[PDB]
Assembly symmetry: D2
Homo-oligomer: 251 residues x 4
């Protein structure tokens, strides 16, 4: 059970992170939605009730992420779970032939900074807050769950920056789990396929037609169920799980 756990969920105002918060709060946990000020964070935290609050923060900022973790610790006393869902996507070829356009350096850097450096910035700072917890009976002080993508493995045309960012999350999953093993913090990454979030919601239903079964986009509530299972299962650690209806992405 997740009842009573405190979860900080980056990208919590929409899509996968919002669905996660709704499921964990419906199961008794407390959630802090960490998302940018221009998001619907405050609306969604109101709708989810008194066990969910909004902490405005950009995951690339050390100050702002420290302030949101400080608010979560003040309000709820501790942090037990962090879910990294904050992310952006772009579709830009390395070299776009009809326009003779090279991918810019700044667009690659922006996707790296939000998705990869932003996820490490939350990990590193939440690990220190989870380390102040007393261990449970099984030695555990917290669980950190990251969101990669099947683009880490079958990146499509146009996905170089996105796939590098998500490959980086995959690549650092095991060394962070090994780093935090002495303090009892599990680190697991989910790699979603194609899900019905603002990111995707003809262009869309072609995509969807490619998922072997079920033959549709993923429902965010399915991601949220996998996050609850990862929190609950004490032995799942250092691993990346595809959640994708058996799709393999073509170019």
């Amino acid at each position: 059970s997740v009842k009573g756990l405190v979860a900080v969920i980056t990208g919590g105002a929409s899509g996968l992170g919002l669905s996660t918060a709704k499921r964990l709060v419906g199961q008794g946990a407390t959630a802090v939605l960490l998302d940018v000020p221009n998001s619907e964070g405050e609306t969604e935290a109101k709708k989810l009730g008194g066990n969910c609050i909004f902490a405005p923060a950009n995951v690339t900022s050390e100050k702002e992420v420290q302030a949101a973790l400080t608010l979560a610790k003040e309000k709820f006393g501790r942090i037990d779970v962090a879910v990294n869902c904050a992310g952006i996507a772009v579709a830009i070829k390395t070299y776009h032939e009809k326009k003779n356009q090279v991918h810019t350096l700044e667009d690659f850097q922006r996707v790296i900074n939000v998705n990869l450096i932003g996820t490490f910035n939350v990990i590193r700072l939440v690990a220190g807050v989870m380390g102040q917890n007393e261990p449970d009976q099984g030695g555990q002080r917290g669980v950190i769950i990251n969101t990669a993508s099947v683009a880490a493995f079958e990146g499509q045309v146009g996905q170089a920056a996105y796939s590098a960012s998500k490959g980086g999350i995959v690549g650092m999953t095991l060394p962070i789990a090994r780093d935090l093993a002495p303090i009892g913090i599990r680190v697991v990454t989910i790699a979603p396929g194609l899900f019905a979030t603002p990111l995707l919601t003809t262009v869309r239903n072609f995509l969807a037609s490619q998922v072997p079964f079920p033959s549709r986009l993923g429902d965010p509530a399915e991601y949220a169920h996998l996050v609850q299972m990862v929190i609950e299962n004490p032995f799942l650690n250092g691993e990346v799980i595809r959640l994708d209806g058996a799709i393999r992405m073509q170019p």
Copy 2:
């Protein structure tokens, strides 16, 4: 949830398969333990009550597996879930120079037959029984979960036969999920690390990063329940291993 689902669990008399049966029956499902006659299948099925029965079957025998599946379908109405836990292990080097000892072909074949051919035998026969179910509201007719091992990825010295058998389970997970997509059967594989079961029959726990101990069979059972419940998990292998990576 899993309430009302009917599961067939090979290797169900012991270890990971027994723990899986205990958990699903505790959650309201029915389980049929498929295991060899020499096992404690009957006593464990009686202990679990009327929603658990024992069907004696060797998974390399299509006659015995098909009889066990028919007993399950007649007793409980249908089959919704199959979990392949039947398996054996050996630790035999390919070649051992000091004793000039070559791994026998028979010892390799035996592990492939039980672990890999036996798992495929169950999959192919249970698929058509699941195909008889009316699809649920999301189109699903059943879920098949296999047991590979981290030895599919970091096989140790002595594990050539076991690793070939478990790498075959890994390798066929995707094409069987693609085969069965049109009738709504999901296929997922769990790759355990080191677990506390009779398969071990004295320094193993210290290698695991965290938790730094052998896995508890009930943690495998919990992951099985999650795979059964999640409609979108398919064609994937999941390591359940405390972040271990095996050295030689």
Copy 3:
């Protein structure tokens, strides 16, 4: 350089194993084609000249493989390299809903037996032969190269048996490398994508006439000589071990 090495190449009468033998013999190695009697083995070994001989053997037979290895080792004095290319393919769904047909157990067992158990059979029996070699200055006594397939990773509809057998070769590559590390035999597996060989008749027809469009670049079937070049690089590079290499034009296979 492979000049002077003695290679035993199973599946040597055709396709990838034949091209391998042609390249290695053209670079000065000696090659023993191991392939079934009912094949072009003999003719191809004659066409390749005196450094190429045909040893009839089914890789599922312990006695035939041992007799082919013994023939290589007596004739040429030693065995330095083994290449496993013998294999078969079938396209059979686990369950075919339209025909209400279940994959037979014997069709799965036969593909496992040739592709997986036959490769292990060659490996286990050649390992002791290579361990009689004097180790070179780097400690090496031999190299074993196996052929899996991208089907170990992206098995298609109908490829359950094939992908199980090739997944088995991938899964055992590391433990066999670790087993043979103390006597200096490297173990490497190549996973080809789609190659222009007599094996292609397995695909539908309107599906084979279609392959090239799926390969990003080069946008065509692989040429067997490209597999052979990769085999030569694996034999030459001393530090390649316990690894599987995809050789596929960057394809990822769809269902």
Copy 4:
């Protein structure tokens, strides 16, 4: 044969990139060592003679890489091969309890910027130069080889930033190969284990066989075979003596 090809090798002043340049120039190719101004690049380029020049540049700078590729084109006429070996490493835990010390953001960013963004920076700019080449008889215009690491798969304690950077090179190998397929540029990544370069010079004893650090010239051989094999694309190759890294 690589005879006549022009290769730009980042990190060319030392270690794996230098051994690659030595091997390729000894097989008749031409090589441009792209490495920082403070490296020994110019002296190593003179020792290899007229077919090897140095282009001082930091791979994280657009301007300096553009200048380096223009120098390569001006000297040798075209670019056929790029090899990304420029890289750095740190050993810093995500959180170190005994010191109560969080890994700094800046140390992680530095490693990501040189290893990952710097490799993409070279890839994107060299792809435009290789697209100026007429295709060979097989449609190819160039070959780009990157250097990841086994730390992309078994990153050790202290390797978070390095493993993130190297996992990003692995993750982007396939989409970049797919992006550049229509212009005939293959993209392949090598993931070395443990090699005897300045980055390292009991680790030797953990390699199954050969039981030693890798010799840079074995990485160089593997680069030459990737350049020569027309069908290797979108793949990552471990070059590691069968090691699997423990924590």
